[PDB]
Amino acid sequence: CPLMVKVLDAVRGSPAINVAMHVFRKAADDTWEPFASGKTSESGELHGLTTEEEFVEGIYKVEIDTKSYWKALGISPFHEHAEVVFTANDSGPRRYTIAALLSPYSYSTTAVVTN
Amino acid sequence: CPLMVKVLDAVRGSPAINVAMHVFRKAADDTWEPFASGKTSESGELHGLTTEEEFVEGIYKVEIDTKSYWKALGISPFHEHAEVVFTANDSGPRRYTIAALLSPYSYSTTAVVTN
Amino acid sequence: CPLMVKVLDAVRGSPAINVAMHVFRKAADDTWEPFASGKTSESGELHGLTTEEEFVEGIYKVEIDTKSYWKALGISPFHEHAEVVFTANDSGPRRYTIAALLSPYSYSTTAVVTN
Amino acid sequence: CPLMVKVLDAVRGSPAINVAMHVFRKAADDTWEPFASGKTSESGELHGLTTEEEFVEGIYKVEIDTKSYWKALGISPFHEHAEVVFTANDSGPRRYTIAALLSPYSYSTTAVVTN
Numbered sequence A, B, C, D: 001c002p003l004m005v006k007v008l009d010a011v012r013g014s015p016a017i018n019v020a021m022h023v024f025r026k027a028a029d030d031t032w033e034p035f036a037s038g039k040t041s042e043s044g045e046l047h048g049l050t051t052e053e054e055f056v057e058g059i060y061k062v063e064i065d066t067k068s069y070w071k072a073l074g075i076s077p078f079h080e081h082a083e084v085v086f087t088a089n090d091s092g093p094r095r096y097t098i099a100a101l102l103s104p105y106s107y108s109t110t111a112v113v114t115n
């Protein structure tokens, strides 16, 4: 599993469950092409987005639909979404864990990159 | 000054100086139109991006070139940039301060909305 | 003003106003001695904690009463308080700004050290 | 496992390995009594600090020795340690995951509380 995302809710102190996200890869013509998508599980985790063979060098974008998450809890948040944009695998294949911590007016994202 | 950005460096404990950023507004045709831009000052702050008459309701994107900042310090970063996307909505007088805290593999952004 | 504290509320996107905090300095006998205290202003800031002559090298602790802040808003928090412990060291002129970003189950603190 | 701690390094984008931490419980005489301690593993995790029977209602303090971690990497950091203080189990037994994200001049801590 070369790409995993974990999302946490800083207001309730819980995993952020059923959070949708879309992954894009920058194409040759400088456009964002859809690549994968899914929703976080009861543990706040989204696995199985891609495979080693499919996850080639490139620039990737993870767009996390934080607004729909907060609206479902009755909170009108600041951000439309949380976007993580990064170059992947340019020194060789790596495993990426993207962690996102959500508040209505704030978010933090961090990457753990292992071999 | 209805829109201000402040950027901080978590590795050196300093304002992040000379950080470039561009502000975009979502057009009717779902495209991002350039709106404003600048570089942070010695205090890590960018002022004067827009005016009250110009800063109307809409969806805005602030793209902060964090990668160029870390490259200038010789540090290898994860993110291509830090992106803040939000709807601006005047429910009464509102000033927006976007704060971004930068580390090579992590960033946090928060909005302070005042009257 | 060699030492300033700023506190922000990630749930409401506002300065955290009327937040009490105490500053302690580590004594020779490894005990915490009260040093300064106050409450944040309408801007979320606390100034005038100490002076240049008084703020000597040593180990300092800032204890921010985050629990009372969340209780005043009717929100159930995790932490008893947010604690920032640090050594102050003049290697040349140094001013310290401690920034704290508060959520009910999370807090972030950062130091900006300027000349 | 009622209490787990995970620590991440925001400069290297990796788990923070071999990070020491001590857990204290506030005693009847308002003193902090040592309770448990350990070091994070290669995954940045510390498990097995306590048991359900031992982890009674109370106020707990987790002191993470972040300074020794950064010094071992040749970085002089701002904080002496990262302290997480909280009331545990006052509505019944819970499982607590404490997550800490470390930078030389900043840290964030978050709690995930599950039944």
Ligand SMILES: O=C(O)c1cc(-c2ccc(F)cc2F)ccc1O
Pocket (backbone or CB within 6 Å): B006, B008, B099, B100, B101, B108, B109, B110, C006, C008, C099, C100, C101, C108, C109, C110, C112, D106
């Ligand atoms: O770790 C924090 O407490 C923190 C602090 C800031 C911040 C810093 C300095 C300042 F003048 C204003 C701020 F919002 C911005 C983001 C952030 O996460």
Ligand SMILES: O=C(O)c1cc(-c2ccc(F)cc2F)ccc1O
Pocket (backbone or CB within 6 Å): A006, A008, A099, A100, A101, A108, A109, A110, C106, D006, D007, D008, D099, D100, D101, D102, D108, D109, D110
């Ligand atoms: O407050 C923090 O220290 C923090 C923690 C995480 C995080 C999330 C999930 C996880 F399994 C480990 C983490 F460190 C993600 C972001 C973050 O700011």
